[PDB]
Every structure is written in C-alpha cells, then in structure tokens.
Structure 1
C-alpha cells in the first residue's frame, strides 16, 4: 500500500457571505466592512482652535446681538453653528442673508474696526429697546447705533458719514433701515419730513426709504429693523447720506483667513480628534465609504446608497 501526502487548505465552521462579479452569495473564511454605518455623537475638537457659537447666529457676530457678546471678535480654525441660534434681538431680517452666513462660516476669525461716525446735537445716537437686553438693561446691537431725533417730533437733520478702508484687505460693513409700525412712531422718531437713505461706494450703490407698516408682533414689536451688507475694498470710501431711519454702523468687520464651518447638533468633545463632521457628529472611520449622510464637511469617506459592502479577506470557505 503506497504512503500518502495530501495537500489542503483551512476552513471555518461559520464563513461570511460576500458578493463577487459572478456570485451574489459567495461564502469566504473572513471579510471586512468597507461602508461605515456608525458615527460618534460628538464634535471631536482636539487639536482645533474651535469656537462653539451656541445660541449666537453667525450674522449676530457682525451686528452684535447680545447672544453674540462673547463672539464679536477672535480667531478660530473651526466655527460651529447651532440650530435656532439668534441673529436679531429686534425683529427683522438681512437681505442676501445666506450669502453673509456662508462668508462668516468660511472665516478663520473676525476683527472689528471703528467707523468713526458722529452725529449732531439734535440726534440721539443711543436708541435702545427692551427687545435687546444687555447687563439687565435696555440696549441695542453692539456694532450699530439707532439714530433718532433728540426732541420728539422734530425733523432728523440731513447727515453724511463716510467710512474709508485704511487696510490692505477688504472689510464687511452692515447697516439697518428702521421700518416704523405707524405714522405716529415715524413722526416722533424722525419728524414729518420725507425720509431718504443713500449708500454709495466704488463697488456698491443703493437707495432706501423707511416703509411705515404694522408687522406681526415678534419680541413684542410691530416695527422692523432690516439689515444690508457690502464689502469695502482696500482704500475705498463708502458714504451714508440720511435724514432718519438709518441704523448706522459704529464698527465694520474684517474676516481673517479661512476656517471649517460646521452646522451640528452634537456636543463638543475636546478629548477626541476628527477631520470629518456632519449634523449628527464626527466620522473617525478608516473605511473608504459611509452611509450616515450625503451632507459632510472636512476630509471624509464618500457617501454611498449601501447598508454594507463586505470585502473578502480569505479564500472560499468549504467546510467539512
């Protein structure tokens, strides 16, 4: 009877199912996942000079809503925006709002520069409201001035103010137009005269008229302050000509360098690091694909419409 040598390969009791070019259900000895299905329910901020805005809306940083008092200036490589964050203590909206939010959330910081705007003796330039509370007292947007007639009912004097950008980088300037709730309010604040607000630079020209109208009650007020913005190029002069209704800037903004804007509901964790963020937190997987969200920022696995894609790490399993 001849002696015998037999050649063979290993097998495992329970193999794993993978797909091939030719077979939907190929059993192999081992396989590993290529699509990440799990996220950390935190924003991993280790190694990042990050700013969590909390209830401060990015636009609130430029106009100086009380909620944004800790976020008026600074530097960051990562800026985190939260749901239902406050921009407007006084009711109103910004024209081209989303464009402005995007620019702030792309920034690596904000510097503030004084406009140097002054007002004659017949102007009260410290108009305040119960809608914008600061230090347990009636206040206003930190970076703007509510200009009204010092004497109730008196015509607001014709005023011209100019901001010159003395810097080598562009500045962002914002202003408001007050839309009174009634003719009685308009007359008391600015007088009976017809109101006209002109804004002019090299790169921007526009004209505004306070529209009197009783709007729905928001923060106890039927009036509105609506905001406008433009960029002031290096060396340029922007001129405000007004006789009532202008909410004038006391400072302009400079957006410094670049940063990663994140919109998320996930709490900060300074103990973990990450390069990939979404609404629900951080993705620290080494895998090439993820099925968490098509909406991610940073350096991320690619989104795929797949629960699982198993990569074989062994031969066909042929058990005994």
Structure 2
C-alpha cells in the first residue's frame, strides 16, 4: 500500500533544560533567562551626569577643596567614588547617612547666599594647613571660621539670621569647633564661656565647644562637627553665638530627583543603561541576573543561580 507518515523535526545538537519532572530534558532549542555578564563601565548615554571623582557628596555642601568644581549643578545621575573626601579639617557630620542619601537622591544643587555680615571685632577669614587650596592655607568654601580679630579677646555676642524667600525648602549647614587645647580656645574666642544657639520654627538646638585631648588627624587634635536642618519657605533661622560657630556663607537647595550610583567603573557615554551596580552596568533584556543583589535603577531581579534555560522548542529525539 501507499503511505503517508507524520513526524516532527529534530536537531543534531539539542539543549538540556529542567522541567517539573526531569532535571535532564533534551529540547531542540532554549534560551537563557539569567544574565551572567556585566559591562565594566557606567553607561551614561542619554544621561546628564556628574562624576564626583575624589569629592564626597557632603563636601559639595560645605565646600571642601576636592569639591570646588561640584558646589552647584544639575544632573539626572550622580556618581560617588571610593575613598571620596568630605572633611579637610578633622571632624564629622551629625546624621551623616541621612544627609548623604538626600544629596544622592537629588537632581542638582543650587547655592543661595546667607548674607551674613560680621562686625569689626570678628575675623571671618580663619584658615588652616589642613584645607589647602593652590598651595595656601584655606577653608571650607561655603562656611567661615569666625574668630576674634584681636588674639585673646572675647568674641562678641553675635546674631545672624537667614530667611528663606524662595518657594522651596533650603538646606542649611553649620559647624561647631571643638579646640584641642585651652590656650587655643582662648586665642580664638577668649576666656569667656562659649555657647551656640540655633533656632527656627521647625528646629532648635544648643551647642558648647569642648576642649579635650584627642589624637592628631592630618596633624590636628581639634575637630569641627557639622550639623544641619531644612529651613521651610518663608521661615527664618537664627544663629546666636559668642565663639566657636563655623558659620555658613551660603545655603543649599536640592532640585528634583536623580539616581545616585556608588561605583568604581569608568564612564562610557557611548553605552546606554537603566541598571547599575558596583562593578558597572547591567544591559540586558533578561528578567533575572546573578551579578549582585546590590543594584540601583530599573533592574532584573537578583537570583542565586548560574543558569536557568527556558525551552523554545519540543523534545529533541534524534535519529
């Protein structure tokens, strides 16, 4: 008799996939669902970005020398690097983590003058070997180390007031100097009892410089601790002090939103991406990735798996 036979294709080299019932099932074709490869670069095509280099985000607000080119700007992406510099004079910022994350969430910084002026008893141009600029002693660009003009004399009872005339909230910072020795405390501010008060409608606090022995950081046992708050539109903030205030010459306004990235990978303007990690960019259409659980942006979900092959064909039954 004549005959007609029904059949299906096969391939010489099939691919192994896993099913509900079988770990080693051969199919005609399959495709990977877990991304294993990363580009070792930050893909910045179509992104107005700022690479901070050795500038730490907090340094952008206080004006550390390393941040002189990053005091203002707009960006959709802000890139922070390892071992970035925030403090030239030894010290720290209170609530540092919350502040850094606010900066890394922003889409830019604008600076507005406080307009603080000082009487003739105040020398507002104090500088230090710790904060070098062009081979000369200098200071945080956005603040002023206020000291007594005459060495040893009492720093006068001063009031400085900043009013937010803008429609948006402004971030203000200041420092408190904690001298290394009593003789240094007396030289800059006098023998009087020192006290700094700061008050607004939504914030208030008081500070006292403390003299105390500490080890030297960058050659100095002294410390400048930074503090901060948000001044709401229309509100004012009042600084009352008589020695030890590191006063702001400017305040910051954070604008919009941007993606903060922490990474050691070099910029590539010819590559475009939505997902980033410490080691670079994840440019894939695949739903999963095994590169790192620490990613930012619009990303594939991290999974603890080398490979997960999705079948794109029938069982392979070769001849």
TM-score, scaled to structure 2: 0.99
Consecutive unaligned residues of structure 1, counting only runs of 5 or more, are none
Q: Once the 2 structures are TM-superposed, how far is the Cα of residue 213 of structure 1 from its aligned partner?
A: 1.2
Is the contact made by 1:173 and 1:249 (CA closer than 8 Å) also made in structure 2? yes
Q: Once the 2 structures are TM-superposed, how far is the Cα of residue 294 of structure 1 from its aligned partner?
A: 1.2
Q: Which runs of 4+ in 1 moved over 4 A?
A: none
- Correspondence for 2:109: 110
Q: Once the 2 structures are TM-superposed, how far is the Cα of residue 319 of structure 1 from its aligned partner?
A: 1.3
Cα distance in structure 2, aligned partners of 1:270 and 1:9 = 48
TM-score, scaled to structure 1: 0.98
Cα distance in structure 1, aligned partners of 2:127 and 2:312 = 69
Is 1:242 aligned to residue 244 of structure 2? no
* Higher deviation after alignment, 293-302 or 224-233: 293-302
Q: Once the 2 structures are TM-superposed, how far is the Cα of residue 171 of structure 1 from its aligned partner?
A: 0.1
Q: Once the 2 structures are TM-superposed, how far is the Cα of residue 136 of structure 1 from its aligned partner?
A: 2.1
Cα distance in structure 1, aligned partners of 2:213 and 2:168 = 41
Q: Once the 2 structures are TM-superposed, how far is the Cα of residue 3 of structure 1 from its aligned partner?
A: 2.5
Q: Once the 2 structures are TM-superposed, how far is the Cα of residue 120 of structure 1 from its aligned partner?
A: 1.3
Q: CA RMSD in A?
A: 0.8
* Other structure's SS at 2:103 match: helix
Cα deviations by residue, 1:150-178 (Å, 9 ceiling, x for unpaired): 11111111101000000000000000000
Cα deviations by residue, 1:162-214 (Å, 9 ceiling, x for unpaired): 00000000000000000000111101111110100000000110000001112
Q: Once the 2 structures are TM-superposed, how far is the Cα of residue 5 of structure 1 from its aligned partner?
A: 2.4
Cα deviations by residue, 1:10-52 (Å, 9 ceiling, x for unpaired): 2222211111111111110111000001110000001000000
Cα distance in structure 2, aligned partners of 1:99 and 1:87 = 15
* Other structure's SS at 1:247 match: strand
* Higher deviation after alignment, 128-137 or 61-70: 128-137
* Other structure's SS at 1:62 match: helix
* Other structure's SS at 2:112 match: strand
Is the contact made by 1:190 and 1:243 (CA closer than 8 Å) also made in structure 2? yes
Cα distance in structure 2, aligned partners of 1:215 and 1:101 = 26
Is the contact made by 1:30 and 1:314 (CA closer than 8 Å) also made in structure 2? yes
Q: Once the 2 structures are TM-superposed, how far is the Cα of residue 135 of structure 1 from its aligned partner?
A: 2.2
* Other structure's SS at 1:113 match: strand
Cα distance in structure 1, aligned partners of 2:178 and 2:162 = 24
* Other structure's SS at 1:93 match: strand
Q: Once the 2 structures are TM-superposed, how far is the Cα of residue 142 of structure 1 from its aligned partner?
A: 0.3
* Other structure's SS at 1:8 match: strand
Cα distance in structure 2, aligned partners of 1:272 and 1:236 = 45
Cα distance in structure 2, aligned partners of 1:298 and 1:53 = 19
Cα distance in structure 2, aligned partners of 1:144 and 1:214 = 25
Q: Once the 2 structures are TM-superposed, how far is the Cα of residue 220 of structure 1 from its aligned partner?
A: 1.0
- Correspondence for 2:276: 277
Cα deviations by residue, 1:85-144 (Å, 9 ceiling, x for unpaired): 000011100000000000001111111011111111111100001111112211100000
Q: Once the 2 structures are TM-superposed, how far is the Cα of residue 252 of structure 1 from its aligned partner?
A: 0.2
Q: Once the 2 structures are TM-superposed, how far is the Cα of residue 6 of structure 1 from its aligned partner?
A: 2.0
* Other structure's SS at 2:154 match: coil
- Correspondence for 1:198: 197
Is the contact made by 1:215 and 1:224 (CA closer than 8 Å) also made in structure 2? no
Is the contact made by 1:176 and 1:226 (CA closer than 8 Å) also made in structure 2? yes
